[PDB]
Amino acid sequence: MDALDLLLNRRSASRLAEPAPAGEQLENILRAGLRAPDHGTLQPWRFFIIADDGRERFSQLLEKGAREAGQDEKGIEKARNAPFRAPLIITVVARCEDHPKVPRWEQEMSAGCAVMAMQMAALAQGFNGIWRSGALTESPVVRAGFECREQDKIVGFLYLGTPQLKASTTIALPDTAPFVTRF
Amino acid sequence: HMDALDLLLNRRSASRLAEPAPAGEQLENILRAGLRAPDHGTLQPWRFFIIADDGRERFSQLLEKGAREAGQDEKGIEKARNAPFRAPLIITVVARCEDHPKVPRWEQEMSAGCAVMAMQMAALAQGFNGIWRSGALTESPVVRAGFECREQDKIVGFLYLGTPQPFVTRF
């Protein structure tokens, strides 16, 4: 795949199935995330790989978080079923530290950029994924499951796999006119 | 041209930048890359500002004003005013945020931040490069007013552009 083409046509996929990226292709995804821009080279990220019986453990963690948040039956059921929408999930935590010259939001932003880079690396190899978050990124139960300290943040659950639909190449490039001004 | 995977795995920024800046169709490609940022709710929560030629001088004056009104000393004021002349082109990205309970503010800021990275990568993909900068004056009231920021908006980066010269756990 061409680099400019990937960037111009970057699309996510929510319908995902086996096979998951694995072995060297998963390692390529992880290294792409570690190349996220990073003010001060703080490497403010932790990555959790969720696969196989990890998905069942993730289901139990999310259900407990949904119950603890007071969600209704439908929300608890959605949390229970969430991990089985893809064969692999990578949870990205912004691991933040007190650096007076590097604001917290910049460290979080670097972790978020890692998510996007990993989705792009998936796409570049014939896989795809979708960056998901929702209210349970803020659940104490869920954050404790991902070893969050008080200043850390879950910035995404990146669902990964083989997309059921090939990424469309039949769609026009975005229009810049409403978003761009000359300063 | 450039392999997509090699772009991602070897991605690097560049701070030493010179003319020529990307222009014409190559700049348009950079902007279109930013507009493909992941976007929860398709809120399109971004505004881009092209800073070049006389806009660099106007940007310089705005930063100088911000440093001056914050009481910085002469060195800080001069560093602020000189900053835009380190690259032939700068793109300012504003996270233009709206109240949607299903899409918290931080996610919209994230989308705008991802737009910066995508634009930097599009520069790199075309033989240019750049560096995402921010600094303390992104918060300056006069600087935010210069970029039309409402209280809920945020300057997430100044992307300088030109011609260049232990983490993983199994759950």
Ligand SMILES: Cc1cc2nc3c(=O)[nH]c(=O)nc-3n(C[C@H](O)[C@H](O)[C@H](O)COP(=O)(O)O)c2cc1C
């Ligand atoms: C920080 C962040 C959080 C997101 N969270 C969700 C989410 O919880 N659920 C969802 O469907 N999309 C979410 N999205 C949007 C998707 O990742 C994706 O961009 C969306 O499906 C639009 O498709 P596209 O990327 O192909 O344009 C999020 C995006 C960002 C930047």
Ligand SMILES: Cc1cc2nc3c(=O)[nH]c(=O)nc-3n(C[C@H](O)[C@H](O)[C@H](O)COP(=O)(O)O)c2cc1C
């Ligand atoms: C939100 C954000 C703001 C940043 N601001 C600056 C900055 O003001 N000055 C700077 O030298 N680097 C800044 N960086 C880091 C650079 O963009 C770049 O990542 C750094 O020079 C490391 O080079 P590399 O991207 O090639 O790894 C910032 C990064 C992020 C994510």
